[PDB]
Design an enzyme around this catalytic site. Sequence first.
Site, PDB file in Angstrom:
ATOM      1  N   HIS A  74      -2.164  -0.965   8.686  1.00 20.62           N
ATOM      2  CA  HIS A  74      -3.126  -0.969   7.672  1.00 20.62           C
ATOM      3  C   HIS A  74      -3.381  -2.485   6.897  1.00 20.62           C
ATOM      4  O   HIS A  74      -4.046  -2.427   6.172  1.00 20.62           O
ATOM      5  CB  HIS A  74      -3.323   0.112   6.642  1.00 20.62           C
ATOM      6  CG  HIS A  74      -1.970   0.025   5.529  1.00 20.62           C
ATOM      7  ND1 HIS A  74      -0.780   0.812   5.862  1.00 20.62           N
ATOM      8  CD2 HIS A  74      -1.746  -0.756   4.612  1.00 20.62           C
ATOM      9  CE1 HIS A  74       0.174   0.587   4.838  1.00 20.62           C
ATOM     10  NE2 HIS A  74      -0.478  -0.313   4.160  1.00 20.62           N
ATOM     11  N   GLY A 108       2.233  -3.530  -2.254  1.00 18.92           N
ATOM     12  CA  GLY A 108       2.691  -4.497  -1.640  1.00 18.92           C
ATOM     13  C   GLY A 108       4.288  -4.265  -0.932  1.00 18.92           C
ATOM     14  O   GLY A 108       4.737  -5.287  -0.320  1.00 18.92           O
ATOM     15  N   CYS A 133       4.599  -2.130   1.561  1.00 22.23           N
ATOM     16  CA  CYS A 133       4.635  -1.847   2.928  1.00 22.23           C
ATOM     17  C   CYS A 133       5.015  -2.869   3.690  1.00 22.23           C
ATOM     18  O   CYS A 133       4.953  -4.168   3.739  1.00 22.23           O
ATOM     19  CB  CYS A 133       3.118  -1.532   3.188  1.00 22.23           C
ATOM     20  SG  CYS A 133       2.629   0.143   2.364  1.00 22.23           S
TER      21      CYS A 133
HETATM   22  C1  LIG Z   1       1.414  -0.306   1.014  1.00 22.97           C
HETATM   23  O1  LIG Z   1       2.260  -1.386   0.441  1.00 22.97           O
HETATM   24  C2  LIG Z   1       1.181   0.917   0.095  1.00 22.97           C
HETATM   25  C3  LIG Z   1       2.483   1.214  -0.697  1.00 22.97           C
HETATM   26  C4  LIG Z   1       2.289   2.217  -1.645  1.00 22.97           C
HETATM   27  C5  LIG Z   1       1.413   1.544  -2.944  1.00 22.97           C
HETATM   28  C6  LIG Z   1       2.060   2.717  -3.874  1.00 22.97           C
HETATM   29  N1  LIG Z   1       3.224   3.147  -3.727  1.00 22.97           N
HETATM   30  C7  LIG Z   1       3.342   2.901  -2.143  1.00 22.97           C
HETATM   31  O2  LIG Z   1       4.271   3.188  -1.321  1.00 22.97           O
HETATM   32  N2  LIG Z   1       0.576   1.919   0.778  1.00 22.97           N
HETATM   33  C8  LIG Z   1      -0.692   2.028   0.621  1.00 22.97           C
HETATM   34  O3  LIG Z   1      -1.550   1.516   0.002  1.00 22.97           O
HETATM   35  C9  LIG Z   1      -1.186   3.404   1.611  1.00 22.97           C
HETATM   36  C10 LIG Z   1      -2.286   2.907   2.512  1.00 22.97           C
HETATM   37  C11 LIG Z   1      -2.718   3.820   3.404  1.00 22.97           C
HETATM   38  C12 LIG Z   1      -1.526   4.503   4.198  1.00 22.97           C
HETATM   39  C13 LIG Z   1      -3.859   3.407   4.385  1.00 22.97           C
HETATM   40  N3  LIG Z   1      -1.872   4.209   0.480  1.00 22.97           N
HETATM   41  C14 LIG Z   1      -0.716   5.056  -0.032  1.00 22.97           C
HETATM   42  O4  LIG Z   1       0.131   5.147   0.122  1.00 22.97           O
HETATM   43  C15 LIG Z   1      -1.835   6.048  -0.843  1.00 22.97           C
HETATM   44  N4  LIG Z   1      -1.386   7.596  -0.677  1.00 22.97           N
HETATM   45  C16 LIG Z   1      -2.220   8.189   0.107  1.00 22.97           C
HETATM   46  O5  LIG Z   1      -3.266   7.792   0.427  1.00 22.97           O
HETATM   47  O6  LIG Z   1      -1.623   9.408   0.593  1.00 22.97           O
HETATM   48  C17 LIG Z   1      -2.371  10.361   0.527  1.00 22.97           C
HETATM   49  C18 LIG Z   1      -3.256  11.025  -0.705  1.00 22.97           C
HETATM   50  C19 LIG Z   1      -2.027  11.295  -1.635  1.00 22.97           C
HETATM   51  C20 LIG Z   1      -2.650  11.671  -3.006  1.00 22.97           C
HETATM   52  C21 LIG Z   1      -3.977  11.615  -3.294  1.00 22.97           C
HETATM   53  C22 LIG Z   1      -4.870  11.200  -2.318  1.00 22.97           C
HETATM   54  C23 LIG Z   1      -4.501  10.936  -0.969  1.00 22.97           C
HETATM   55  C24 LIG Z   1      -1.471   5.885  -2.593  1.00 22.97           C
HETATM   56  C25 LIG Z   1      -1.616   4.291  -2.653  1.00 22.97           C
HETATM   57  C26 LIG Z   1      -2.077   7.103  -3.266  1.00 22.97           C
END
Ligand SMILES: *[C@H](O)[C@H](C[C@@H]1CCNC1=O)NC(=O)[C@H](CC(C)C)NC(=O)[C@@H](NC(=O)OCc1ccccc1)C(C)C
Lengths: 306, 306
Positions: free
Chosen positions: B41, B143, B145
């Site tokens: 991603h 950041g 990830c």
């Molecule tokens: C990448 O570094 C990032 C790390 C996360 C930011 C905050 N804590 C973390 O671990 N990861 C992301 O931004 C992902 C990207 C996706 C996989 C394309 N997004 C998330 O982790 C979101 N979570 C998520 O979408 O899970 C499903 C969901 C949960 C709750 C409500 C709606 C959907 C997160 C930023 C909410």
Amino acid sequence: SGFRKMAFPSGKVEGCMVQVTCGTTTLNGLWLDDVVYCPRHVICTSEDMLNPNYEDLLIRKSNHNFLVQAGNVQLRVIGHSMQNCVLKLKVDTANPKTPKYKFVRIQPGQTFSVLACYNGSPSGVYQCAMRPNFTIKGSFLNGSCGSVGFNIDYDCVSFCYMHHMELPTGVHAGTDLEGNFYGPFVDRQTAQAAGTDTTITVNVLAWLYAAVINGDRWFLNRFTTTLNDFNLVAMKYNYEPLTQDHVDILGPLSAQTGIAVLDMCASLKELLQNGMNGRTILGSALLEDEFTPFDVVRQCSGVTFQ
Amino acid sequence: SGFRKMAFPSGKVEGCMVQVTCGTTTLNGLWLDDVVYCPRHVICTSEDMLNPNYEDLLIRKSNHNFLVQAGNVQLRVIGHSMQNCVLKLKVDTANPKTPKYKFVRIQPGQTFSVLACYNGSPSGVYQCAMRPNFTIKGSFLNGSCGSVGFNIDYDCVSFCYMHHMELPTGVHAGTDLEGNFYGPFVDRQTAQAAGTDTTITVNVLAWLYAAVINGDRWFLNRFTTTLNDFNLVAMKYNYEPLTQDHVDILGPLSAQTGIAVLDMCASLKELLQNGMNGRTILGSALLEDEFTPFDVVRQCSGVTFQ
Ligand SMILES: *[C@H](O)[C@H](C[C@@H]1CCNC1=O)NC(=O)[C@H](CC(C)C)NC(=O)[C@@H](NC(=O)OCc1ccccc1)C(C)C
Ligand SMILES: *[C@H](O)[C@H](C[C@@H]1CCNC1=O)NC(=O)[C@H](CC(C)C)NC(=O)[C@@H](NC(=O)OCc1ccccc1)C(C)C
């Protein structure tokens, strides 16, 4: 989000660990520039340790009695001296992996990372706090002496602890890197009192702020209190008295969360008086005091080092 | 003595962390030989993340759209491909700090160390467990990830986890280094259920053995039990059922302490039924399940790595 007890990345310290042998005793040393630092009781037999005259024992030793081994790189010892409770072995080679470093004497309530080592090889890394009674609650076996505690500021390693001994409590004592013990302890195998410990109040508050930042807010109550009012509750429960210096240190966390420090104190007071009622905070059923305000801020802002 | 949640020394992994940028998004990559691994991603805008077609998005990218930065050493990208949920960027330079390594897919209940990173620079290291529901309880910000989880066997780093996302619980999900998610999760910003978690029974028992080795023995009771008898208590309290494979794994700890596993189970059963009554075990007021039997043995035998 989330909150974990996090140690500093240990790579810069790994590059400094060496094995020091004198006679049959082997422990860890710290190799920085052309000096190796280690506990002076490396020169003792098991019997010497009951009441060692370190000056007399060291006089029987010469440079070639100290074997210093860095992995399999092996160092020539060209000078030795005793500074307080540490030996400084001068070697003919500067450690090419020497990081930017400083020797610091930390204060009770501060935290640092420990790199636990045996025969000069790292085994694990973990975080802890210098207790108010100048002990630490570590994980240390025979051969771990000379393992060190440290903090990192970007590229600079501040060494603050070298392990020497275990006390009749399962708690641990050691020195700074100039060889001065934290607390009243001496490097002799004789019964030694640590004295009463206390809980580090400003660290508990920092951890409550951490909890709020991470969604745990059930303990946020309705009340407020005063410093004196809270400090009366503090000494009932063997918490350190809170000072205005501590309130100021908690300023950034107070500003981030919109919770006044004295309001957070009123929550803490109720937690001390009523317990947690079988609930948890940040995955713990006890009030945690081994995160400083700086620890919380670095973990909730993502500070990095290299 | 003493018992701490100990991470592996992180130096070997620190040498592999890089920063990967595509467009405005920046995350961490793992640089091993001439390949950099990172979450796919990285190619998404904030809007793409709601429902990304990763194939279509990746087609718009070329080698020169990926900026890989190792400290300030900066790598030329000469190939890219997507394997499941990871990107593999081929670079023109082999990482001179590449350790001996393996990619492993760990099992639920196993533990590993996480090196939390931002912009390709390590921030901290901590230990945890792959939960039975294939989440981890980490500490991860925007950041982070591409940060990785790993174990070390002497000189060999076994990489087992790469961080991708946070779930509506504050829990964390990610992949192995072939890009296959642990559990049912997908890399999309859409609500996702983790499902019921359970406590890792064999790890709790290992930790009770740790406690006995370190002097905490108040919970050692009088009773014994059977596997079925204990397993009935287990599922009342959402503990994994104990198997003979688990009893065998606990063999060395049983032999070291002279406590039969089924006797230890009877202690655990009473702790589950009656609580701890405000007492603690190894400094904890909860039953801890993130130490494997191997974790306990390495910490009470002093295993080292290099
Ligand atoms: C990448 O570094 C990032 C790390 C996360 C930011 C905050 N804590 C973390 O671990 N990861 C992301 O931004 C992902 C990207 C996706 C996989 C394309 N997004 C998330 O982790 C979101 N979570 C998520 O979408 O899970 C499903 C969901 C949960 C709750 C409500 C709606 C959907 C997160 C930023 C909410
Ligand atoms: C060096 O690696 C070693 C590390 C300890 C072994 C087990 N856990 C440790 O941290 N340290 C020692 O062997 C010291 C050597 C001394 C300083 C010359 N000895 C100890 O730590 C003993 N503790 C001790 O003498 O403290 C006073 C005392 C306590 C209880 C009963 C009598 C005396 C320890 C091995 C008992």
